[PDB]
Amino acid sequence: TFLVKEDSKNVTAYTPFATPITDSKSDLVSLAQLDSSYQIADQTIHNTNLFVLFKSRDVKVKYESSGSNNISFDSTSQGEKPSYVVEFTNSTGIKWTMVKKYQLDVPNVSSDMNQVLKNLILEQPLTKYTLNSSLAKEKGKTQREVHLGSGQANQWTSQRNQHDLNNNPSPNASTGFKLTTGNAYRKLSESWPIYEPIDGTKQGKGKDSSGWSSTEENEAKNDAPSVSSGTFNKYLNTKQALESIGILFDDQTPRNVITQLYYASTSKLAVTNNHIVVMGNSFLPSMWYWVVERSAQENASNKPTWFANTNLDWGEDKQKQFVENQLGYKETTSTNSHNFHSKSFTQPAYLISGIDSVNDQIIFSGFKAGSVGYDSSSSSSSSTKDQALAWSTTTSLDSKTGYKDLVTNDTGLNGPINGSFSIQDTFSFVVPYSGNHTNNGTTGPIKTAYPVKKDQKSTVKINSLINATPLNSYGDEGIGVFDALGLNYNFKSNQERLPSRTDQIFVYGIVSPNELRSAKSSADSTGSDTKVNWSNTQSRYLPVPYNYSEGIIDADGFKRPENRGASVTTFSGLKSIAPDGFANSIANFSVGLKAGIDPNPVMSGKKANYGAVVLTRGGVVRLNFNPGNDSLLSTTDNNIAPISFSFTPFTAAESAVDLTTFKEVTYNQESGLWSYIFDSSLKPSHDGKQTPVTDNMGFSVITVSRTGIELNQDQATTTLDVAPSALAVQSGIQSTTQTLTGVLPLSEEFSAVIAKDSDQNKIDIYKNNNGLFEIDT
């Protein structure tokens, strides 16, 4: 029998004949002995029992920079509503009864962690209505402007050696983006605004919470009023959009960053034979995750593990350093120059695609949320004051071809180097040279350095920030756009896309029960921050489709003259033509990670195959694993890109689907097919211009199938050299009128759709032809 979620707290069971079981509508929130403010966040089936995640709309969390126990629930005003994971069972018809109830307590904080948190600042979440221009921030100081000062041009050649930028050919390379304007950056105790600038290069107060609350917020309220009578020339009102992505409010005002971080961090559920795993959502970053031992006592506090303590394998040692060297500045010749890199932490947040389990293994994926240092000096003063220190790390044109050599390239490892370079009859934004290489021949090794002057080394305060997108540098320049859309190509006979290693990074992997026990120990460590190691992980540069932006039509080394023009080179300039329910065409999104075991037989004496699929902006990604080792699939040749990742573009039908309305991902074990359910009723009621939405009705379903030569099929396929892929195709189940309840996969050859057009229910039976549906009236 199949289970259907009637609403935010009720669950109704159906027989395989698409008929509802009488007296089966159960209120699990009531059953779990939880109050009205709670609703079911995620459901999964393990060991035949239903595991349910619950989260309260009434949760309140505080961050107190002083003290030992910094992150805590606000007991005082009935905000001590932690999230719960409950095991339910059938005691027979359908009669649910609670087995175990686990509570997810806030994270513990060390002395070292709290020194980052004290001055940690966070970007306002990205919305359905957020533009390329809202995201855009004013360009920072030039490399020669930081280390040398103003009017120090054509003196670079003689002075670059002292500042340890020996032979560096890019004085004009940007050092980051200014934080005095653009999208709001807030402390964990501070709250985010309902307003978003239309142009971040001009409108906005960035990290200046004080300057916003005193003067700018009032201009914002006047321009972009809630419900319209408003002008909407400088600002967008996204209260409705914010609310639709899980933002909690005190009427009009959103709750502080820490509360939003908690509520969104308890979004997805995975269950193994000994552990329960809880991760965040795709909308806003997750700085932690929960590993709950299923053997935990009735009233015990289950604490999360920080991502800043979970050391991942980025594929290569160099790939990890790239991410870390940009997290902040080291040495701390100041005293309060605390950031993540200095306090010896790793990547602190991820925008989680999802989490699932196969053969007691946990599978995760997501994009790495951008994180960089920033200056907070407050005065003469430092040249980098009120600015983020981020840069492009895209592989140089002169680099060796072959995946391993492209990703290990020392281009932009310690400091910035990319810009704009004229090559023959075209151009590039990536530095043409690395090592001893120059146009004349060999000139001595090229050096890079963190954008901090060595004279101002002591009188500088480099603290930490976290972005709401997979973009590290938002500085309004050429290279920013090519790194975001994947428009950097080499010029050698065999073309190759030069990857970035900090911007639009997709991280994925498989976690063992012992790797999860390690994670649990780190959450329970008191005193020192205990470090975790996840071995079977990988990273891949996954950018947004270039054709989602107006003005770009191909991806080649040769670039047309019109493509050096400002209108299609900077963020504010760039215009979106993306149909996937996002106003921006620059930041990538991922959702619906679901793994499944292949029904097709494998060679005798070999373990059954299993993979995972996930949806990203522009296509479907497939994660390939070796079942004999329960590791990521790999191959002998390093020149070929990790065979554990595959990407297949979408067509106009799949691109048309609003990725922000993802409801549920299912997998049919007998078919080997994934059903991606999108409910249009998950749309916000009003635009950024407060105009009522008129397309929040209906649904859509996408089928995902395995393609390619699969492992251990025969004697030849015992090893692979090509990554097996996936295919996303609009199933044929869709509506613009009906409001979906759920989809019953009645059989391999049949499916049932439960919906309401005018309150009364309707059961639609569709004919299934290996993933392709046509209605049976």
Author numbering: 27 to 118, 121 to 255, 261 to 412, 416 to 813
Published text:
The human pathogen Mycoplasma genitalium, a member of the pneumoniae cluster of mycoplasmas, binds to eukaryotic cells by means of its adhesion complex, the Nap. This complex is formed by two heterodimers, each consisting of proteins P110 and P1401–6. In addition to their roles in cytadherence and motility, P110 and P140 are immunodominant proteins and constitute the main target of host antibodies during infection. Here, we address the structure and mechanism of the Nap adhesion complex and reveal an intricate interplay between P110 and P140.
